[PDB]
Design an enzyme around this catalytic site. Structure first.
Site, PDB file in Angstrom:
ATOM      1  N   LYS A  79       9.422   2.009 -11.110  1.00 55.28           N
ATOM      2  CA  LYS A  79      10.842   2.289 -11.349  1.00 55.28           C
ATOM      3  C   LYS A  79      11.509   2.384  -9.978  1.00 55.28           C
ATOM      4  O   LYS A  79      10.870   2.733  -8.999  1.00 55.28           O
ATOM      5  CB  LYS A  79      11.066   3.628 -12.073  1.00 55.28           C
ATOM      6  N   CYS A 125       0.845  -1.177   0.000  1.00 55.74           N
ATOM      7  CA  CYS A 125       0.000   0.000   0.000  1.00 55.74           C
ATOM      8  C   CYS A 125       0.890   1.241   0.000  1.00 55.74           C
ATOM      9  O   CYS A 125       1.087   1.874   1.032  1.00 55.74           O
ATOM     10  CB  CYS A 125      -0.935  -0.065   1.206  1.00 55.74           C
ATOM     11  N   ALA A 126       1.487   1.565  -1.143  1.00 57.49           N
ATOM     12  CA  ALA A 126       2.535   2.573  -1.251  1.00 57.49           C
ATOM     13  C   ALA A 126       1.896   3.946  -1.422  1.00 57.49           C
ATOM     14  O   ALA A 126       0.779   4.049  -1.934  1.00 57.49           O
ATOM     15  CB  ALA A 126       3.396   2.325  -2.472  1.00 57.49           C
ATOM     16  N   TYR A 152       1.482 -10.523   1.062  1.00 62.30           N
ATOM     17  CA  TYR A 152       1.591 -10.606  -0.396  1.00 62.30           C
ATOM     18  C   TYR A 152       1.393 -11.986  -1.038  1.00 62.30           C
ATOM     19  O   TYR A 152       0.682 -12.077  -2.053  1.00 62.30           O
ATOM     20  CB  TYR A 152       2.877  -9.940  -0.910  1.00 62.30           C
ATOM     21  N   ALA A 158       1.081   4.425  -4.928  1.00 66.23           N
ATOM     22  CA  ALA A 158      -0.140   3.712  -5.263  1.00 66.23           C
ATOM     23  C   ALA A 158      -1.330   4.581  -4.903  1.00 66.23           C
ATOM     24  O   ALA A 158      -2.215   4.780  -5.736  1.00 66.23           O
ATOM     25  CB  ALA A 158      -0.190   2.382  -4.517  1.00 66.23           C
ATOM     26  N   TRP A 159      -1.329   5.146  -3.693  1.00 65.34           N
ATOM     27  CA  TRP A 159      -2.493   5.909  -3.227  1.00 65.34           C
ATOM     28  C   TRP A 159      -2.591   7.167  -4.089  1.00 65.34           C
ATOM     29  O   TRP A 159      -3.662   7.608  -4.485  1.00 65.34           O
ATOM     30  CB  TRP A 159      -2.351   6.280  -1.740  1.00 65.34           C
ATOM     31  N   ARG A 160      -1.455   7.770  -4.394  1.00 61.09           N
ATOM     32  CA  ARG A 160      -1.499   9.042  -5.112  1.00 61.09           C
ATOM     33  C   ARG A 160      -1.685   8.990  -6.630  1.00 61.09           C
ATOM     34  O   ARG A 160      -2.414   9.819  -7.190  1.00 61.09           O
ATOM     35  CB  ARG A 160      -0.334   9.957  -4.699  1.00 61.09           C
ATOM     36  N   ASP A 179      16.261   5.840  -6.499  1.00 62.71           N
ATOM     37  CA  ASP A 179      14.874   6.268  -6.545  1.00 62.71           C
ATOM     38  C   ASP A 179      14.574   7.593  -7.255  1.00 62.71           C
ATOM     39  O   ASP A 179      13.424   7.918  -7.556  1.00 62.71           O
ATOM     40  CB  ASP A 179      14.607   6.624  -5.100  1.00 62.71           C
TER      41      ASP A 179
HETATM   42  N1  LIG Z   1       5.663   8.405  -3.488  1.00 58.28           N
HETATM   43  C1  LIG Z   1       6.869   8.170  -4.007  1.00 58.28           C
HETATM   44  O1  LIG Z   1       7.870   8.436  -3.362  1.00 58.28           O
HETATM   45  C2  LIG Z   1       7.148   7.598  -5.370  1.00 58.28           C
HETATM   46  C3  LIG Z   1       6.929   8.300  -6.553  1.00 58.28           C
HETATM   47  C4  LIG Z   1       7.211   7.738  -7.796  1.00 58.28           C
HETATM   48  C5  LIG Z   1       7.722   6.442  -7.819  1.00 58.28           C
HETATM   49  N2  LIG Z   1       7.950   5.767  -6.684  1.00 58.28           N
HETATM   50  C6  LIG Z   1       8.462   4.393  -6.717  1.00 58.28           C
HETATM   51  O2  LIG Z   1       7.407   3.556  -6.212  1.00 58.28           O
HETATM   52  C7  LIG Z   1       7.945   2.603  -5.300  1.00 58.28           C
HETATM   53  C8  LIG Z   1       7.370   2.917  -3.917  1.00 58.28           C
HETATM   54  O3  LIG Z   1       7.574   4.284  -3.555  1.00 58.28           O
HETATM   55  P1  LIG Z   1       6.586   5.082  -2.554  1.00 58.28           P
HETATM   56  O4  LIG Z   1       7.156   6.483  -2.549  1.00 58.28           O
HETATM   57  O5  LIG Z   1       5.110   5.034  -2.841  1.00 58.28           O
HETATM   58  O6  LIG Z   1       7.050   4.298  -1.198  1.00 58.28           O
HETATM   59  P2  LIG Z   1       6.160   3.995   0.133  1.00 58.28           P
HETATM   60  O7  LIG Z   1       5.009   4.963   0.298  1.00 58.28           O
HETATM   61  O8  LIG Z   1       7.152   3.663   1.223  1.00 58.28           O
HETATM   62  O9  LIG Z   1       5.590   2.561  -0.339  1.00 58.28           O
HETATM   63  C9  LIG Z   1       6.334   1.332  -0.327  1.00 58.28           C
HETATM   64  C10 LIG Z   1       5.299   0.289   0.113  1.00 58.28           C
HETATM   65  O10 LIG Z   1       5.950  -0.978   0.109  1.00 58.28           O
HETATM   66  C11 LIG Z   1       5.583  -1.831   1.188  1.00 58.28           C
HETATM   67  N3  LIG Z   1       6.752  -2.390   1.912  1.00 58.28           N
HETATM   68  C12 LIG Z   1       7.117  -3.691   1.955  1.00 58.28           C
HETATM   69  N4  LIG Z   1       8.230  -3.830   2.703  1.00 58.28           N
HETATM   70  C13 LIG Z   1       8.523  -2.579   3.138  1.00 58.28           C
HETATM   71  C14 LIG Z   1       9.521  -2.077   3.964  1.00 58.28           C
HETATM   72  N5  LIG Z   1      10.444  -2.940   4.457  1.00 58.28           N
HETATM   73  N6  LIG Z   1       9.528  -0.748   4.230  1.00 58.28           N
HETATM   74  C15 LIG Z   1       8.621   0.108   3.731  1.00 58.28           C
HETATM   75  N7  LIG Z   1       7.641  -0.328   2.923  1.00 58.28           N
HETATM   76  C16 LIG Z   1       7.597  -1.661   2.643  1.00 58.28           C
HETATM   77  C17 LIG Z   1       4.773  -0.934   2.110  1.00 58.28           C
HETATM   78  O11 LIG Z   1       3.482  -1.463   1.831  1.00 58.28           O
HETATM   79  P3  LIG Z   1       2.662  -2.194   3.004  1.00 58.28           P
HETATM   80  O12 LIG Z   1       3.073  -1.580   4.318  1.00 58.28           O
HETATM   81  O13 LIG Z   1       1.230  -1.877   2.648  1.00 58.28           O
HETATM   82  O14 LIG Z   1       3.164  -3.619   2.934  1.00 58.28           O
HETATM   83  C18 LIG Z   1       4.922   0.492   1.581  1.00 58.28           C
HETATM   84  O15 LIG Z   1       3.697   1.233   1.714  1.00 58.28           O
HETATM   85  C19 LIG Z   1       9.464   2.699  -5.404  1.00 58.28           C
HETATM   86  O16 LIG Z   1       9.962   1.749  -6.374  1.00 58.28           O
HETATM   87  C20 LIG Z   1       9.689   4.153  -5.836  1.00 58.28           C
HETATM   88  O17 LIG Z   1      10.980   4.293  -6.457  1.00 58.28           O
HETATM   89  C21 LIG Z   1       7.679   6.317  -5.491  1.00 58.28           C
HETATM   90  C1  LIG Z   2       5.564  19.762  -7.010  1.00 59.54           C
HETATM   91  C2  LIG Z   2       6.467  19.855  -5.800  1.00 59.54           C
HETATM   92  C3  LIG Z   2       6.851  18.718  -5.100  1.00 59.54           C
HETATM   93  N1  LIG Z   2       7.665  18.811  -4.043  1.00 59.54           N
HETATM   94  C4  LIG Z   2       8.043  17.579  -3.331  1.00 59.54           C
HETATM   95  C5  LIG Z   2       6.903  16.696  -2.805  1.00 59.54           C
HETATM   96  C6  LIG Z   2       7.522  15.320  -3.059  1.00 59.54           C
HETATM   97  O1  LIG Z   2       8.240  14.943  -1.876  1.00 59.54           O
HETATM   98  C7  LIG Z   2       8.634  15.396  -4.100  1.00 59.54           C
HETATM   99  C8  LIG Z   2       8.240  14.865  -5.489  1.00 59.54           C
HETATM  100  O2  LIG Z   2       6.940  15.372  -5.819  1.00 59.54           O
HETATM  101  P1  LIG Z   2       6.407  15.167  -7.348  1.00 59.54           P
HETATM  102  O3  LIG Z   2       7.347  15.794  -8.342  1.00 59.54           O
HETATM  103  O4  LIG Z   2       4.991  15.637  -7.295  1.00 59.54           O
HETATM  104  O5  LIG Z   2       6.585  13.601  -7.668  1.00 59.54           O
HETATM  105  P2  LIG Z   2       5.775  12.313  -7.109  1.00 59.54           P
HETATM  106  O6  LIG Z   2       5.766  12.435  -5.604  1.00 59.54           O
HETATM  107  O7  LIG Z   2       4.566  12.277  -7.998  1.00 59.54           O
HETATM  108  O8  LIG Z   2       6.824  11.130  -7.372  1.00 59.54           O
HETATM  109  C9  LIG Z   2       8.041  11.171  -6.767  1.00 59.54           C
HETATM  110  C10 LIG Z   2       8.106  10.987  -5.394  1.00 59.54           C
HETATM  111  C11 LIG Z   2       9.392  11.018  -4.859  1.00 59.54           C
HETATM  112  C12 LIG Z   2      10.531  11.196  -5.633  1.00 59.54           C
HETATM  113  C13 LIG Z   2      10.462  11.347  -7.016  1.00 59.54           C
HETATM  114  C14 LIG Z   2       9.177  11.344  -7.554  1.00 59.54           C
HETATM  115  O9  LIG Z   2       8.784  16.802  -4.272  1.00 59.54           O
HETATM  116  C15 LIG Z   2       8.135  19.998  -3.638  1.00 59.54           C
HETATM  117  O10 LIG Z   2       8.936  20.072  -2.667  1.00 59.54           O
HETATM  118  N2  LIG Z   2       7.801  21.127  -4.299  1.00 59.54           N
HETATM  119  C16 LIG Z   2       6.981  21.074  -5.376  1.00 59.54           C
HETATM  120  O11 LIG Z   2       6.649  22.135  -5.956  1.00 59.54           O
HETATM  121 CL   LIG Z   3       7.046   8.110 -13.823  1.00 62.61          CL
END
Ligand SMILES: NC(=O)c1ccc[n+]([C@@H]2O[C@H](COP(=O)([O-])OP(=O)(O)OC[C@H]3O[C@@H](n4cnc5c(N)ncnc54)[C@H](OP(=O)(O)O)[C@@H]3O)[C@@H](O)[C@H]2O)c1
Ligand SMILES: Cc1cn([C@H]2C[C@H](O)[C@@H](COP(=O)(O)OP(=O)(O)Oc3ccccc3)O2)c(=O)[nH]c1=O
Ligand SMILES: [Cl-]
Ligand SMILES: [Cl-]
Ligand code: NA
EC number: 1.1.1.384
Length: 325
Positions: free
Chosen positions: A95, A10-11, A56, A14-16, A175
């Site tokens: 990725k 539940c990342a 999982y 995923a939620w966003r 990342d």
């Molecule tokens: N929001 C972002 O930062 C973001 C943006 C673009 C791409 N990505 C990519 O998407 C993937 C996840 O990123 P995310 O940012 O969404 O990360 P996140 O919010 O930490 O999500 C990772 C999910 O993986 C699960 N998990 C399983 N083992 C874990 C562990 N040991 N520690 C933490 N989480 C664990 C958790 O799901 P459960 O607790 O539900 O098992 C957690 O919610 C990565 O490959 C990242 O490079 C991330």
């Molecule tokens: C707009 C914006 C974002 N963030 C922060 C908020 C967030 O911590 C980080 C990236 O926001 P985003 O470019 O929206 O990318 P995703 O989160 O969709 O995917 C990734 C998540 C993490 C790493 C890379 C991509 O920048 C800022 O600090 N300022 C900004 O104006």
């Molecule tokens: Cl992307």
């Protein structure tokens, strides 16, 4: 009949991004969402539908799952993509697909043997703005390209973030730096070769928090790539040509409704073009589901994912590592 999608982890992404796209896409049905904590699964299903699943493996055993979305920390991608593929599920993996090139080749091989799609979810590749830029450059708007720069840097994440753990999140190169490195491949092509880089490692947490890499094609078109999570927000790329230069912001994560602006400068004259808004997250999810449904798995996607993985490994291995303080 929509493909039935299950989610493992539940990342935040995923939620966003992923789940709202899955839920709105007619071609995909969210059937199950798994978490290490049932309570978190349930909160996700209350939001996006499907059955909440504890752990999982249970989800992978489901008969009503056709494809699995894997938004797990990078370091954990490989074990679970391998298991989902061996369960007979197609896979949309966040990725970076995995942490290195030999691991990625092994995952594609497991997939290949079962006829399954494994797709690395570089959603930005699905935004039309990059092809509109590439078409302007191909039309000569700045002459021949001399060099390229791309940057994705963000302000520090909260303590406890997956990126601050080498063996879960694996840090700013795996990342974040994968983005500018991927844009360099998209625009400069398949012969990029490592030249030099720096990675800053924070001793306290032992994780890469920023870096800069220099790559080149064999004709000497250079790419200067910056990434990090100790920084103000930047998210851009720029091309320097023989008669002008072109740059753009919000290149990796434009909002669905956000209209890109291409900036061009040349001698005594500058221009800005407003492009249409597009939902890159919807488009990438749509592309995945169409490939699954049609059986047409583009060969270029996996070849680009393999080359991407080699360049990332080349940077990690080639970089000068500096620990601070
Ligand atoms: N929001 C972002 O930062 C973001 C943006 C673009 C791409 N990505 C990519 O998407 C993937 C996840 O990123 P995310 O940012 O969404 O990360 P996140 O919010 O930490 O999500 C990772 C999910 O993986 C699960 N998990 C399983 N083992 C874990 C562990 N040991 N520690 C933490 N989480 C664990 C958790 O799901 P459960 O607790 O539900 O098992 C957690 O919610 C990565 O490959 C990242 O490079 C991330
Ligand atoms: C707009 C914006 C974002 N963030 C922060 C908020 C967030 O911590 C980080 C990236 O926001 P985003 O470019 O929206 O990318 P995703 O989160 O969709 O995917 C990734 C998540 C993490 C790493 C890379 C991509 O920048 C800022 O600090 N300022 C900004 O104006
Ligand atoms: Cl992307
Ligand atoms: Cl702007
Ligand atoms: Na090194």
């Amino acid at each position: 009949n929509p493909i039935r999608v299950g989610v493992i982890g539940c990342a935040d992404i995923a939620w966003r991004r992923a789940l709202p796209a899955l839920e709105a896409e007619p071609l995909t049905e969210v059937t199950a969402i798994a978490s290490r904590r049932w309570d978190r699964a349930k909160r996700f299903t209350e939001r996006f539908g499907g059955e909440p699943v504890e752990g999982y493996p249970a989800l992978l055993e489901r008969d009503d799952v056709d494809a699995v979305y894997v938004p797990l920390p990078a370091v954990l991608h490989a074990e679970w993509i391998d298991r989902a593929l061996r369960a007979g599920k197609h896979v949309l993996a966040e990725k970076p697909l995995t942490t290195d090139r030999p691991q990625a080749e092994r995952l594609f091989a497991v997939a290949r043997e079962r006829g399954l799609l494994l797709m690395e979810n570089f959603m930005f590749l699905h935004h039309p703005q990059h092809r509109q830029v590439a078409d302007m450059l191909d039309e000569g708007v700045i002459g021949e390209i001399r060099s390229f720069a791309a940057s994705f840097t963000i302000p520090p994440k909260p303590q406890g973030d997956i990126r601050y753990q080498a063996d879960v999140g694996g840090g700013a190169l795996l990342d974040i730096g994968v983005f500018p490195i991927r844009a360099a491949g998209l625009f400069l092509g398949a012969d990029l070769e490592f030249v030099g880089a720096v990675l800053r490692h924070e001793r306290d947490r032992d994780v890469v928090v920023g870096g800069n890499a220099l790559l080149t094609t064999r004709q000497g078109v250079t790419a200067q790539l910056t990434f990090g999570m100790e920084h103000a927000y930047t998210n851009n790329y720029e091309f320097r040509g023989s008669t002008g230069r072109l740059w753009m912001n919000r290149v990796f994560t434009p909002p669905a409704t956000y209209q890109p602006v291409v900036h061009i400068e040349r001698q005594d004259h500058a221009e800005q073009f407003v492009l249409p808004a597009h939902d890159q997250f919807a488009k990438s999810i749509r592309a995945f589901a169409q490939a699954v449904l049609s059986g047409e798995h583009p060969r270029e996607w996996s070849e680009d994912s393999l080359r991407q993985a080699s360049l990332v490994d080349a940077v990690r291995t080639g970089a000068r590592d500096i620990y601070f303080p």
